[PDB]
């Protein structure tokens, strides 16, 4: 489960560098489930990133690094699409 | 320098129609007409489209830095470069 600031968020490139290679190696080899808060800002976003080209550089191998995101419902822009009465297949 | 002179002869033939010469002309006379009123083939040269070219040198700069890990660990290992260390 990793956690980082949000909305005003500002790193060195080394920090950023351990994002690319140490935390998608130790997750892409155990099978792991990494857990954090869903958000396109600040730490989130560059885990959104750093696993997203994982699996186009996988080059049709099998299995994705699963990750699950976990926000609140009150502060989301356009969630009044999103709310469907019946199943929103 | 056989391998390098391979590239040639195939673009040659690549390029020419397929008659044998007393039926080329059959092809000369279509290509000088169509020249006559108004571009390699695409299997040699293409301009993808912009949306899968973003996608393909994204692919690119992923790799090279994989590269670049490897060149530098294996160049950490002569003999050199520990007597420095």
Same mark, same amino acid.
């Given at each position: !489960? @990793?956690?980082?600031?949000?909305?005003?968020?500002?790193?060195? #490139?080394?920090?950023? !560098?351990?994002?690319?290679?140490? *935390?998608?190696?130790?997750?892409?080899?155990? %099978?792991?489930?990494?857990?954090?808060? %869903?958000?396109?800002?600040?730490?989130?976003?560059?885990?959104?990133?750093? @696993?997203?080209?994982? +699996?186009? !550089? +996988?080059?049709?191998?099998? %299995?994705?690094?699963?990750?699950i995101?976990?926000?609140?419902?009150?502060?989301?822009?356009?969630?009044?699409? *999103?709310?469907? #009465?019946?199943? +929103?297949? | 320098?056989?391998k $390098?002179?391979?590239?040639?002869?195939?673009?040659?033939?690549?390029? /020419?129609?397929?008659?044998?010469?007393? $039926?080329?002309?059959?092809?000369? =006379?279509? =290509? $000088?007409?169509?020249?006559?009123?108004?571009?390699?083939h695409?299997?040699?040269?293409?301009?993808?489209?912009?949306?899968?070219?973003?996608?393909? =040198?994204?692919?690119?700069?992923?790799?090279?830095?994989?590269?670049?890990?490897? /060149?530098? $660990?294996?160049?950490?290992?002569?003999?050199?470069?520990?007597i420095?260390?």
């Amino acid at each position: !489960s @990793v956690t980082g600031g949000a909305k005003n968020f500002n790193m060195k #490139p080394r920090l950023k !560098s351990i994002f690319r290679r140490g *935390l998608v190696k130790v997750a892409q080899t155990t %099978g792991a489930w990494i857990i954090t808060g %869903g958000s396109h800002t600040g730490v989130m976003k560059q885990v959104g990133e750093a @696993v997203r080209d994982f +699996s186009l !550089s +996988s080059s049709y191998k099998e %299995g994705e690094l699963i990750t699950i995101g976990v926000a609140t419902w009150g502060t989301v822009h356009r969630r009044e699409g *999103l709310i469907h #009465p019946t199943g +929103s297949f | 320098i056989w391998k $390098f002179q391979r590239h040639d002869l195939i673009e040659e033939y690549h390029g /020419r129609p397929a008659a044998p010469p007393p $039926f080329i002309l059959l092809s000369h =006379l279509q =290509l $000088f007409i169509k020249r006559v009123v108004l571009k390699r083939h695409k299997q040699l040269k293409n301009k993808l489209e912009k949306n899968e070219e973003a996608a393909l =040198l994204s692919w690119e700069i992923y790799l090279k830095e994989n590269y670049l890990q490897n /060149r530098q $660990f294996q160049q950490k290992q002569r003999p050199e470069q520990k007597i420095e260390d």
